[PDB]
Amino acid sequence: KAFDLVVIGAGSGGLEAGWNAATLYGKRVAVVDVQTSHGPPFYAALGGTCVNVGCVPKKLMVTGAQYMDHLRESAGFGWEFDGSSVKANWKKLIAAKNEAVLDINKSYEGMFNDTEGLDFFLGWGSLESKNVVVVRETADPKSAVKERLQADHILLATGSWPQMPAIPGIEHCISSNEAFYLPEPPRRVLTVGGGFISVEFAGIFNAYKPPGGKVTLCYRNNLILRGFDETIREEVTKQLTANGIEIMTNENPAKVSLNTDGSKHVTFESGKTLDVDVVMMAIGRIPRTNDLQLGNVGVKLTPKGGVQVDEFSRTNVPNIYAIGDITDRLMLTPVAINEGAALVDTVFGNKPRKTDHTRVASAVFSIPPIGTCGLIEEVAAKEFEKVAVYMSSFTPLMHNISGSKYKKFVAKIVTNHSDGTVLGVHLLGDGAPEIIQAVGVCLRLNAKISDFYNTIGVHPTSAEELCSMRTPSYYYVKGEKMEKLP
Amino acid sequence: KAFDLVVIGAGSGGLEAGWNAATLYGKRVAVVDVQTSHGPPFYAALGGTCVNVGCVPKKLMVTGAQYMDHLRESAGFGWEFDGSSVKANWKKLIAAKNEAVLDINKSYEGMFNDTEGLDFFLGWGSLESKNVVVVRETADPKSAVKERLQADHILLATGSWPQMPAIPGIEHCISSNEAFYLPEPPRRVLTVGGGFISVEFAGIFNAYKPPGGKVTLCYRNNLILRGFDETIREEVTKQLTANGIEIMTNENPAKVSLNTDGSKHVTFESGKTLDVDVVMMAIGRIPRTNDLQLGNVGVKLTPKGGVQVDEFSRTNVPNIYAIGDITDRLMLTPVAINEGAALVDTVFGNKPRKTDHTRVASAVFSIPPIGTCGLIEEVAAKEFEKVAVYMSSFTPLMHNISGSKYKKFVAKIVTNHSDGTVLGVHLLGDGAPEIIQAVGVCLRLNAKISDFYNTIGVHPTSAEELCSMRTPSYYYVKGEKME
Ligand SMILES: Cc1cc2nc3c(=O)[nH]c(=O)nc-3n(C[C@H](O)[C@H](O)[C@H](O)COP(=O)(O)OP(=O)(O)OC[C@H]3O[C@@H](n4cnc5c(N)ncnc54)[C@H](O)[C@@H]3O)c2cc1C
Ligand SMILES: Cc1cc2nc3c(=O)[nH]c(=O)nc-3n(C[C@H](O)[C@H](O)[C@H](O)COP(=O)(O)OP(=O)(O)OC[C@H]3O[C@@H](n4cnc5c(N)ncnc54)[C@H](O)[C@@H]3O)c2cc1C
Ligand SMILES: Cc1nn(Cc2c(C)noc2C)c(=O)s1
Ligand SMILES: Cc1nn(Cc2c(C)noc2C)c(=O)s1
Ligand SMILES: Cc1nn(Cc2c(C)noc2C)c(=O)s1
Numbered sequence: 008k009a010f011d012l013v014v015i016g017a018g019s020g021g022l023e024a025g026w027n028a029a030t031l032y033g034k035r036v037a038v039v040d041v042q043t044s045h046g047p048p049f050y051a052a053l054g055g056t057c058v059n060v061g062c063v064p065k066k067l068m069v070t071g072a073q074y075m076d077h078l079r080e081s082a083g084f085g086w087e088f089d090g091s092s093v094k095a096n097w098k099k100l101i102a103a104k105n106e107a108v109l110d111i112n113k114s115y116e117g118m119f120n121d122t123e124g125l126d127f128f129l130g131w132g133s134l135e136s137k138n139v140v141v142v143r144e145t146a147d148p149k150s151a152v153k154e155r156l157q158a159d160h161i162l163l164a165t166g167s168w169p170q171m172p173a174i175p176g177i178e179h180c181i182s183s184n185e186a187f188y189l190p191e192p193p194r195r196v197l198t199v200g201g202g203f204i205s206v207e208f209a210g211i212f213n214a215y216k217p218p219g220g221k222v223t224l225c226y227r228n229n230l231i232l233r234g235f236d237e238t239i240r241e242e243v244t245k246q247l248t249a250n251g252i253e254i255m256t257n258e259n260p261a262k263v264s265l266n267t268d269g270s271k272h273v274t275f276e277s278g279k280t281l282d283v284d285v286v287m288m289a290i291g292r293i294p295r296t297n298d299l300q301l302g303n304v305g306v307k308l309t310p311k312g313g314v315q316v317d318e319f320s321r322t323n324v325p326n327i328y329a330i331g332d333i334t335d336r337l338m339l340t341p342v343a344i345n346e347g348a349a350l351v352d353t354v355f356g357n358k359p360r361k362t363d364h365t366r367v368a369s370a371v372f373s374i375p376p377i378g379t380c381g382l383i384e385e386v387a388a389k390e391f392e393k394v395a396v397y398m399s400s401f402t403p404l405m406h407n408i409s410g411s412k413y414k415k416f417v418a419k420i421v422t423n424h425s426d427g428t429v430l431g432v433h434l435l436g437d438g439a440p441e442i443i444q445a446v447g448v449c450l451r452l453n454a455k456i457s458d459f460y461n462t463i464g465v466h467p468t469s470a471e472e473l474c475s476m477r478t479p480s481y482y483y484v485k486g487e488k489m490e491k492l493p
Numbered sequence: 494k495a496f497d498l499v500v501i502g503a504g505s506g507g508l509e510a511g512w513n514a515a516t517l518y519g520k521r522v523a524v525v526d527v528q529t530s531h532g533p534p535f536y537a538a539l540g541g542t543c544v545n546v547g548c549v550p551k552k553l554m555v556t557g558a559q560y561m562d563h564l565r566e567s568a569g570f571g572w573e574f575d576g577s578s579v580k581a582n583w584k585k586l587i588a589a590k591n592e593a594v595l596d597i598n599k600s601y602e603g604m605f606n607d608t609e610g611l612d613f614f615l616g617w618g619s620l621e622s623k624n625v626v627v628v629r630e631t632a633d634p635k636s637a638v639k640e641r642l643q644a645d646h647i648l649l650a651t652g653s654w655p656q657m658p659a660i661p662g663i664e665h666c667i668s669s670n671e672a673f674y675l676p677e678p679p680r681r682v683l684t685v686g687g688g689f690i691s692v693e694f695a696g697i698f699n700a701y702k703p704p705g706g707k708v709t710l711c712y713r714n715n716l717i718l719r720g721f722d723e724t725i726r727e728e729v730t731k732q733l734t735a736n737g738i739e740i741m742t743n744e745n746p747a748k749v750s751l752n753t754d755g756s757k758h759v760t761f762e763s764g765k766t767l768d769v770d771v772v773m774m775a776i777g778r779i780p781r782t783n784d785l786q787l788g789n790v791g792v793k794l795t796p797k798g799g800v801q802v803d804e805f806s807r808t809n810v811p812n813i814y815a816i817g818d819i820t821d822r823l824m825l826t827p828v829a830i831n832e833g834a835a836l837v838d839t840v841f842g843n844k845p846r847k848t849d850h851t852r853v854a855s856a857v858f859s860i861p862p863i864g865t866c867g868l869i870e871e872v873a874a875k876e877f878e879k880v881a882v883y884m885s886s887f888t889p890l891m892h893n894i895s896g897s898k899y900k901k902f903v904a905k906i907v908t909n910h911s912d913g914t915v916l917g918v919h920l921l922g923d924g925a926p927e928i929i930q931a932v933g934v935c936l937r938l939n940a941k942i943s944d945f946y947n948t949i950g951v952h953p954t955s956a957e958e959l960c961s962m963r964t965p966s967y968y969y970v971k972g973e974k975m976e
């Protein structure tokens with residue numbers, strides 16, 4: 008019942024911290040989660056949000072959705088078929104995804120049993136005191152104590168949870184959590200939000216919709232994918248539109264009612280209406296702090312609800328740390344993992360290390376996908392006197408043959424024009440997520456535009472475009488956009 | 494007519510050199526090629542081997558061949574269709590490829606029309622003297638003179654040509670050149686060679702073969718793709734086999750005769766026999782120096798037939814340079830292009846530059862594909878006291894669902910273990926050619942394994958494997974493997 012480390016949440020960050028502590032420093036670790044395998048009622052489970060209702064299932068489902076493009080595109084390369092026999096069996100996709108996620112759930116179970124002093128506890132973690140975690144049967148603080156855990160160090164890794172706008176008929180709407188388990192693919196769906204989860208799911212639904220189906224994505228402002236490169240935001244919008252997805256910008260649901268047939272009558276703030284079979288809210292995720300009872304030990308939260316941390320993932324309470332989505336910064340699995348590894352190398356390995364939250368490669372499995380690392384030009388332009396933008400945007404040849412002429416590949420490099428240093432790389436097109444990973448290493452090594460253009464291309468690839476840009480397309484000078492320097 | 498530079502071969506390296514000399518250095522430039530557009534009789538043409546009968550068309554045809562796998566694999570993700578109603582129309586593929594190649598031919602035609610001081614001449618270029626290129630009607634040096642071009646500077650850029658073994662019945666065999674123009678897809682095809690062209694064409698033929706067809710690849714040695722990472726060589730063998738390609742290793746054609754029905758009767762050195770519709774020789778490519786009459790100026794060749802060059806692409810004759818495959822070093826379009834730029838910068842820019850032929854990212858568009866940059870471990874292990882190998886090999890999750898459970902993604906990093914410097918990165922699996930490009934930039938920046946494993950992964954990707962390897966799988970210490 009006494010542990011070097013107690014971790015609340017057996018997710019991306021929590022398991023990395025847990026496993027590393029146990030196996031790298033022979034430490035004694037307790038990991039708490041509410042559920043041992045994916046799905047209702049708690050959705051996240053052993054493995055965390057990414058494994059159960061996140062990156063893993065989403066990617067399998069986006070891969071499934073990609074086959075709609077492959078069938079259509081194959082014809083240009085001489086593939087012949089009756090397009091009339093083509094059906095997208097959503098139920099098969101969901102059962103395959105479920106089997107894949109369950110096997111990972113079982114993978115982690117074996118990990119805990121096989122591993123000395125690494126123990127899993129089922130139930131709800133909360134803080135009783137500085138050095139005691141209590142595991143309860145429910146999220147209610149009043150429920151039975153399954154366990155009392157003595158902790159030299161406590162790690163909070165409870166991640167995040169979908170925010171559902173408090174509108175009349177929100178109970179008719181789902182989140183990404185329920186999207187993973189729909190028994191049937193919606194004919195008509197409204198994905199609410201302009202971020203990666205809304206965009207990815209619009210893609211998935213668009214491929215699996217029954218005949219005369221329609222995917223509508225709404226976003227409360229003017230242009231989806233805030234924080235992404237502007238060229239890419241406008242291009243993804245076009246390419247989603249080109250593939251039959253209806254993008255409603257400057258629109259936001261005001262309420263939902265059930266029609267008598269069980270469909271959803273959506274009324275927008277603008278007064279517009281839309282009938283859909285599914286309303287999926289993806290307007291944001293919020294740190295899961297409530298249920299930990301942070302009032303009991305005085306862990307400080309931010310003006311946004313995230314556990315306040317320093318560079319070393321330390322709370323205001325010594326021995327108590329927080330990593331991943333609960334910190335409400337970059338909500339990415341590899342960041343959570345990095346923070347967990349760093350924390351344990353600091354606290355248990357006597358090798359202090361801080362996660363670098365700059366120059367993080369990330370992706371959107373939009374169709375087609377985004378791969379990005381480092382600063383967008385608007386952000387670079389406020390920090391640096393002289394910023395150069397290099398841009399190549401063209402439909403690759405195979406997509407002239409495929410018939411998908413709308414699939415422009417976009418490659419942008421943003422530099423500090425004073426020394427050539429690459430500040431950001433932004434890709435839109437097939438392969439972008441794979442291309443961008445080694446770009447992350449390049450940025451860690453402080454690569455300049457001349458390091459890219461002096462490297463010999465791999466031909467033929469989209470990636471070689473990154474090694475073919477020698478001349479800026481335009482600049483920002485003291486924040487001002489212009490074709491040419493003074 | 495008088496030119497600052499005459500370029501023989503309007504190819505990857507020749508066009509880079511010509512354009513750079515004309516537009517960046519304001520030189521007057523002549524370029525010669527034997528054909529204005531792709532295909533028979535001379536196959537390569539304006540644009541070079543890559544455009545006409547290489548990288549460009551082959552990548553399109555592999556993309557086409559990849560849909561066979563997308564067809565089968567879609568079913569695991571719930572796609573449901575009439576499997577018996579699906580046909581691979583090779584005629585449509587070839588027509589789509591031809592239009593794509595012709596469009597490039599035409600744009601090069603336009604580039605010559607619209608670029609002042611860059612002139613294209615049609616026919617066969619050779620050296621009359623050290624400042625005179627003669628353009629003639631045919632490869633025969635007694636053929637009619639079309640032009641005589643006075644040249645301050647001459648660039649040899651004629652590329653390479655398929656090697657055909659002097660065996661009985663060679664005339665009943667084709668090379669990659671003819672493979673691009675087969676009117677119908679062969680039911681039975683033997684690809685001869687373990688190199689990238691044989692492997693890539695085996696994948697193309699395998700996808701478009703008519704019902705009950707069969708692709709056989711034969712190679713003289715024990716394991717295909719010599720020069721590639723050994724783990725990758727064994728996996729690509731297994732993955733080709735799993736997709737119905739017969740890999741005949743330690744086998745080589747002794748002779749070919751025609752069966753009565755016009756099919757090819759192949760006799761292997763081992764006595765073995767195989768009847769096929771097509772025999773594609775992909776056993777090598779040799780520099781195209783015969784037709785250049787280099788004996789007229791005394792340009793030094795190797796016994797191989799390549800033009801010998803210093804690191805600046807200089808022949809033993811001043812004002813005569815060679816770049817690209819004719820130099821028989823690295824036969825890649827981007828290397829030829831790099832050599833052309835470096836030469837012109839050197840000669841016309843007084844900006845002296847040599848192409849680094851080390852740490853060049855390359856690909857094989859096998860199914861699945863390879864991406865590689867830098868040294869394989871066996872090579873590193875001879876040149877370094879301590880070599881670490883970081884290896885990750887696993888069927889990615891999507892391929893458990895797709896049913897292609899044979900599709901292991903291999904990621905291998907080879908380091909100098911004394912300081913962690915990455916010497917080589919070798920990838921097998923979907924995306925590998927796209928992943929390896931920015932790896933080339935890493936190796937230029939002398940990336941260490943710690944630069945890889947301290948970089949935060951993009952998830953979920955195959956590429957993140959490169960950033961998830963903290964601990965060597967095994968070592969070479971003074972040439973010896975130690976697990
Ligand atoms: C739809 C979707 C798609 C995504 N796609 C990607 C992607 O492609 N790439 C990417 O990098 N990221 C992606 N993410 C984000 C990624 O899932 C998260 O950043 C990551 O899982 C956060 O890790 P963590 O360690 O913060 O917590 P999580 O992995 O969320 O783990 C939290 C765990 O804590 C448990 N828990 C919560 N409260 C308690 C309690 N009181 N007691 C016990 N256990 C508790 C939960 O059951 C859960 O298992 C996606 C997210 C979603 C929702
Ligand atoms: C099937 C195949 C696939 C390939 N795939 C790839 C790949 O994916 N990626 C890659 O990087 N490389 C690839 N290559 C290699 C690439 O094509 C070559 O390395 C590149 O084209 C060589 O460029 P170059 O300038 O040396 O010559 P080339 O591009 O071959 O140009 C030589 C030109 O000279 C002309 N010529 C020859 N003799 C004469 C003469 N006497 N007078 C006038 N003109 C003449 C020819 O008509 C030709 O246009 C492939 C090669 C082949 C055969
Ligand atoms: C720094 C930057 N971040 N990103 C990607 C991203 C991530 C990760 N989460 O939200 C956005 C937007 C950019 O494109 S600039
Ligand atoms: C017709 C259909 N058959 N397929 C398989 C396929 C083909 C053929 N090319 O790309 C894919 C993917 C479908 O997904 S509908
Ligand atoms: C150095 C290395 N070069 N390569 C790729 C390659 C190329 C290009 N031509 O022959 C080989 C083999 C490796 O795999 S190790």
Ligand SMILES: [Br-]
Nearest residue numbers: 714715716719
């Ligand atoms: Br061998």
Ligand SMILES: [Mg+2]
Nearest residue numbers: 119120122125
């Ligand atoms: Mg245990």
Ligand SMILES: [Mg+2]
Nearest residue numbers: 605608609611
């Ligand atoms: Mg001209």
